[PDB]
Amino acid sequence: MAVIADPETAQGFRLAGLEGYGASSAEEAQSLLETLVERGGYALVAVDEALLPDPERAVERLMRGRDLPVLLPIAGLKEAFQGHDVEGYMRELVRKTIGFDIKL
């Protein structure tokens, strides 16, 4: 289980035990994500919200192998002290699903 979320606050995730990496540059984080989907880091990668909205497209390009490395947008900490916009996140997830701006 690996994360790419923060420069220093990923040490709390390491303090949970679960491994990770932080770079605060998008392309070295994505390159360690690339060696993390080659050497599969135990099936979970949690990626920062306000650094990568969609982490999955480049990863399914550079690996059409199956979705055992699961990719989540995990929340940035600073924006976590604002408000999650749970509603708008589910709006963009449903519009990523079927395109429609239909609201459940």
Binding site: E19, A75, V86
Partner: protein
């Protein structure tokens, strides 16, 4: 094509009738999957919001823990903790499709 006789006209009427039933069958299947999608979307946003509340708890505790003590003590501690490995993904075979659900191993109390 097919060489037209009175047999193949009824065979193509039968094939048309089967496809006209199959369109309505797949529309009923799509309706059942819409019902299950609107089932899961509120559960997903509920679990997301609970993740947000526990995120506020964990980030405030991590800031305060590296704050009152030093950064080096929690740095050496976090580089001392065992890597919590063996977390993996097992079967949810449904719609004939295995989706990987995730469970961990958690060496925690030691």
């Amino acid at each position: 094509q097919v060489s037209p006789t009175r047999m193949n006209l009824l065979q193509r009427r039968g094939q048309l009738r089967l496809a006209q039933k199959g369109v309505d069958l797949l529309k009923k299947k799509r309706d059942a999957l819409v019902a299950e999608f609107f089932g899961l979307v509120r559960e997903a946003m509920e679990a997301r919001k609970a993740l947000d509340q526990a995120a506020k708890e964990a980030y405030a505790a991590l800031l305060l823990a590296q704050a009152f003590d030093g950064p080096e003590v929690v740095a050496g501690a976090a580089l001392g903790v065992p890597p919590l490995e063996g977390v993996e993904a097992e079967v949810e075979n449904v719609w004939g499709s295995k989706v990987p659900r995730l469970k961990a191993t958690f060496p925690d109390g030691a």
